[PDB]
Structures are given as C-alpha cells and as structure tokens.
Enzyme design. Structure first.
Site, mmCIF file in Angstrom:
data_model
loop_
_atom_site.group_PDB
_atom_site.id
_atom_site.type_symbol
_atom_site.label_atom_id
_atom_site.label_comp_id
_atom_site.label_asym_id
_atom_site.label_seq_id
_atom_site.Cartn_x
_atom_site.Cartn_y
_atom_site.Cartn_z
ATOM 1 N N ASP A 35 0.950 11.755 1.266
ATOM 2 C CA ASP A 35 -0.069 10.245 1.062
ATOM 3 C C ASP A 35 -1.475 10.955 1.148
ATOM 4 O O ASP A 35 -1.890 10.446 2.206
ATOM 5 C CB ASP A 35 1.418 9.292 1.767
ATOM 6 C CG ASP A 35 0.537 8.043 0.914
ATOM 7 O OD1 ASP A 35 -0.551 8.232 -0.110
ATOM 8 O OD2 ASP A 35 0.442 6.810 1.468
ATOM 9 N N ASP A 223 -4.255 9.073 -4.761
ATOM 10 C CA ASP A 223 -4.129 8.466 -4.478
ATOM 11 C C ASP A 223 -2.346 9.195 -4.504
ATOM 12 O O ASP A 223 -1.563 9.052 -5.395
ATOM 13 C CB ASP A 223 -3.390 7.219 -4.591
ATOM 14 C CG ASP A 223 -2.668 7.170 -2.806
ATOM 15 O OD1 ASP A 223 -2.055 7.667 -2.116
ATOM 16 O OD2 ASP A 223 -2.679 5.604 -2.544
HETATM 17 C C1 LIG Z 1 -1.863 4.631 -0.054
HETATM 18 N N1 LIG Z 1 -0.530 5.394 -0.269
HETATM 19 C C2 LIG Z 1 0.918 4.825 -0.845
HETATM 20 C C3 LIG Z 1 0.288 3.670 -1.738
HETATM 21 N N2 LIG Z 1 1.529 3.475 -3.418
HETATM 22 C C4 LIG Z 1 1.816 2.655 -3.464
HETATM 23 O O1 LIG Z 1 0.498 1.462 -3.118
HETATM 24 N N3 LIG Z 1 2.691 2.061 -4.226
HETATM 25 C C5 LIG Z 1 2.956 0.714 -4.403
HETATM 26 C C6 LIG Z 1 4.098 -0.120 -4.021
HETATM 27 C C7 LIG Z 1 5.242 0.715 -4.510
HETATM 28 C C8 LIG Z 1 5.272 2.818 -3.592
HETATM 29 C C9 LIG Z 1 6.259 3.244 -3.489
HETATM 30 O O2 LIG Z 1 6.307 4.572 -3.291
HETATM 31 C C10 LIG Z 1 6.753 5.362 -3.881
HETATM 32 C C11 LIG Z 1 5.928 7.060 -2.722
HETATM 33 N N4 LIG Z 1 4.721 7.786 -3.559
HETATM 34 C C12 LIG Z 1 5.015 8.240 -4.377
HETATM 35 O O3 LIG Z 1 5.845 8.690 -4.335
HETATM 36 O O4 LIG Z 1 3.618 7.948 -5.189
HETATM 37 C C13 LIG Z 1 3.726 9.023 -6.986
HETATM 38 C C14 LIG Z 1 7.573 3.192 -3.462
HETATM 39 C C15 LIG Z 1 8.654 2.718 -4.046
HETATM 40 C C16 LIG Z 1 9.740 2.189 -3.419
HETATM 41 C C17 LIG Z 1 10.333 1.802 -2.286
HETATM 42 C C18 LIG Z 1 8.377 2.172 -1.218
HETATM 43 CL CL1 LIG Z 1 9.086 1.970 0.562
HETATM 44 C C19 LIG Z 1 7.637 2.911 -1.731
HETATM 45 C C20 LIG Z 1 3.409 3.516 -4.440
HETATM 46 C C21 LIG Z 1 0.788 4.422 -0.025
HETATM 47 C C22 LIG Z 1 2.855 3.683 0.024
HETATM 48 C C23 LIG Z 1 3.256 5.700 0.444
HETATM 49 C C24 LIG Z 1 5.513 5.511 0.614
HETATM 50 C C25 LIG Z 1 5.508 3.819 1.305
HETATM 51 O O5 LIG Z 1 4.510 2.721 1.012
HETATM 52 C C26 LIG Z 1 3.366 2.834 0.576
#
Ligand SMILES: CN[C@H](CNC(=O)N1CCC[C@@H]([C@@H](OCCNC(=O)OC)c2cccc(Cl)c2)C1)C[C@H]1CCCOC1
Ligand SMILES: *[C@@H]1O[C@H](CO)[C@@H](O)[C@H](O)[C@H]1NC(C)=O
Ligand SMILES: [Cl-]
Ligand SMILES: [Cl-]
Ligand SMILES: [Cl-]
Ligand SMILES: [Cl-]
EC number: 3.4.23.15
Length: 337
Positions: A35, A223
């Site tokens: 991340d 990001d």
């Molecule tokens: C600050 N960086 C991240 C910002 N991500 C976000 O805001 N979102 C919007 C909400 C759902 C998120 C999605 O993460 C998927 C991973 N990411 C990715 O594979 O990227 C390409 C998500 C979907 C379902 C469950 C969860 Cl916990 C997270 C993505 C911080 C994230 C980093 C991961 C934990 O949550 C904080």
C-alpha cells in the site's frame, strides 16, 4: 548492491491485489496488500480473540513459534478509510522476495468485520514514508534501503486485468527497479509535491472534450492500496452526472449497454494526458440494457493534511505501470503491457 526482487501478486476481481511475505523463523506466510498510501506493516495476531470473526477467517501470527521474534508490546492503532485496527508492536525478520529484513510491525488483535470479512488478504505492508507511519515506526522499504542491497532506491507496480485464464499473472511488485516486460517505451517522471507522501500535482481532469474538473489544479495521491480512482464528493458528483451514472449504496453504475460509448476520462499529469477509456473504467459484466454495470471510480473525501485529493488506484495503475522512486522523490508512469 545490485539486487532487485519480485513478488507475484494475486488479482482478485480487479479490486484486491496482494502477495506473500514470511514473518519469523521458520517463516509464517501472510497475504498482504502493498500500500503506497500507508506506511505501517501489520498482520493478524494469534492473540486476536475469536470474538473477531475477521481473525477467525485470516492467518494469524504466532510469536511463540518464532525464534527470531523480539518482544515490544507498545500499543498501535491504525485508522484507514475502511476502518480501524489495533494491537501492539513486535519485531521479527520479514522476507519479501529475496530480501530479508528485520522489521517492526503491528500484531493486530482487534479487526472489525466491516470490512475485513471481505478482505481476501491477511494484512498490509505500507510502502509510504516514515512521515506517515503511526508511532513513527521505520517503514519496511526504509529498512530495505538501509541494507544497501538494492540496485536502485525504487519500487514499481504492475497490476494486470483479471483473467479467467488460470495462468494470468495477477500482478508484480519489483523492489529495486522496474520490469520492462510489463511496460512499453520510457518512463515519464513526475516530481513529488514533497517527500513524505506519494502525491503529485495534477493540472486537470477532463471527461470527453470539455475540461470539466480540477480546472485550476488539484492533487493526486498514487495509491496502490486503492481499488478505484477516487475524487472528492463534489468532483465525483460532477463526473458522474457527466457520465449519466447513478449512485447506489456501495457504488456508481451505468446501464451496461451504454458503457462502451461513454466518454474517455483524462488526467493531466506532468504536462501529459493520461487517458482511461470506458473499457478501462467500467466493469462490463454484460452489455444488456436491463442490467446495471459498476464503474471503477468513487468518491472519497480524504481529510487534510493529505487530502483533499484525488487518488489514483488500481483502475489507473492497470493502465500505467508505476515506478515509485525514493532516491529522486518522483513517480514514473509508462504504458502497461
Ligand atoms: C491508503 N491506502 C488504502 C486505500 N484503499 C481504499 O481506500 N479502499 C477503499 C475501500 C476498500 C479498499 C479495499 O482495499 C483492497 C486492497 N487494495 C487494493 O488491492 O488496491 C488495488 C478493500 C476491500 C475489501 C476489504 C478491505 Cl479490508 C479493503 C480500497 C488503504 C486500504 C488498504 C487495505 C485495508 O484497507 C485500507
Ligand atoms: C518497544 O518500542 C518503544 C518504542 O521505541 C521503545 O521505547 C521500547 O524500548 C521498545 N520496547 C522494548 C521492550 O524494547
Ligand atoms: Cl502484549
Ligand atoms: Cl494510518
Ligand atoms: Cl472540480
Ligand atoms: Cl476495469
């Protein structure tokens, strides 16, 4: 040093990309998201109570089973857009690629069901700067820079489009460099606004012919933990109206048949146009006019100091291979292939 390591990433539905790290001796395996919008490392702890259904459904780190583990125990709380996690600090040896580093990371003991019940990954490896690390814990890429093993002080991301093919490479992080197998031509580099955040200046966002948005400039966080492109509520409303999209509870949609003839969206970055067509931003599950299709774009009001800002997530990275360069404080983009 002239080492550059690679980590294969799994692509789950074009919304979650994650790879393996090992923690401890012998290594305990975790699926983690790399991340750039955050700077702390964490995985779930063996001391996480069953009461956390999310801890039941993920891999847990057991301090007891590792000989290299060193106690710390300091409280840690990490707040994301998705929710809050808490636990405490531990130190151990983490492998990523061919690289082994000693690292301070969070052992998580409170993990909320919303939304971790939906994470296919176990934890997060923040690739941001120490300026954003909670507890000012030294970030893993900083501990890796220290070893002096890396060919150059840069890492880069290739994110693929999800494929049915059982063989498709979901994605790839390179530590130390970039893989020319996954991008064409040369990098166009843009200077960070300032060290501490992977955020660059953006000159405008255009939808179609007209320069609809960010007409007098705005910010773009690059990001790798973001699934979608995001902008502020007020920009996104404007964009979505321009596309005739409808807001629902979890997403924005369009009539699936209409998606293909929707206008391009361009992002004006370092004097160039970075263009995403509706084939890059619509999830075309079908083309039926009686079905609604989700756009890979949503609103996120990111608070100061880092916001208000746009965030260029996997929707954008899918198209543009991305190199994050610590030596020269800049980000390079090339067309992904
Ligand atoms: C600050 N960086 C991240 C910002 N991500 C976000 O805001 N979102 C919007 C909400 C759902 C998120 C999605 O993460 C998927 C991973 N990411 C990715 O594979 O990227 C390409 C998500 C979907 C379902 C469950 C969860 Cl916990 C997270 C993505 C911080 C994230 C980093 C991961 C934990 O949550 C904080
Ligand atoms: C754990 O972290 C705090 C933060 O540096 C530090 O003061 C302390 O010495 C470390 N704890 C132990 C037990 O070494
Ligand atoms: Cl403890
Ligand atoms: Cl945070
Ligand atoms: Cl605007
Ligand atoms: Cl897409």
């Amino acid at each position: 040093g002239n080492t550059t390591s690679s980590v294969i990433l799994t692509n789950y539905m074009d919304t979650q990309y994650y790879g393996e790290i090992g923690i401890g001796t012998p290594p305990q395996t975790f699926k983690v998201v790399f991340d750039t919008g955050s700077s702390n490392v964490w995985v779930p702890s063996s001391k996480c109570s069953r009461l956390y259904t999310a801890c039941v459904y993920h891999k847990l780190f057991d301090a007891s089973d590792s000989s290299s583990y060193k106690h710390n125990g300091t409280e840690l709380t990490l707040r994301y857009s998705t929710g809050t996690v808490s636990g405490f600090l531990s130190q151990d040896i983490i492998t990523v690629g061919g690289i082994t580093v000693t690292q301070m990371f969070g052992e998580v003991t409170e993990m909320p069901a919303l939304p971790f019940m939906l994470a296919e990954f176990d934890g997060v490896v923040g690739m941001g700067f120490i300026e954003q690390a909670i507890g000012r814990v030294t970030p893993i890429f900083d501990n890796i820079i220290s070893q002096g093993v890396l060919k150059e002080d840069v890492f880069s991301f290739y994110y693929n489009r999800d494929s049915e093919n059982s063989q498709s490479l979901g994605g790839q992080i390179v530590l130390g460099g970039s893989d020319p197998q996954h991008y064409e031509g040369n990098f166009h580099y843009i200077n960070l606004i300032k060290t501490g955040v992977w955020q660059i200046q953006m000159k405008g966002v255009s939808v179609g012919s007209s320069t609809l948005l960010c007409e007098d400039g705005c910010l773009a966080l690059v990001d790798t933990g973001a699934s979608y492109i995001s902008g502020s509520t007020s920009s996104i409303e404007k964009l979505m109206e321009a596309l005739g999209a409808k807001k629902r509870l979890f997403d924005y949609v369009v009539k699936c048949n209409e998606g293909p003839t929707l206008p391009d969206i361009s992002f004006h970055l370092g004097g160039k146009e970075y263009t995403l067509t509706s084939a890059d931003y619509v999830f075309q599950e079908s083309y039926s006019s009686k079905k609604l299709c989700t756009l890979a774009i949503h609103a996120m009001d990111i608070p100061p100091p880092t916001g208000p800002t746009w965030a260029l997530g996997a929707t954008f990275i899918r198209k543009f291979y991305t190199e994050f360069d610590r030596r020269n404080n800049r980000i390079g983009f090339a067309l992904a292939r």
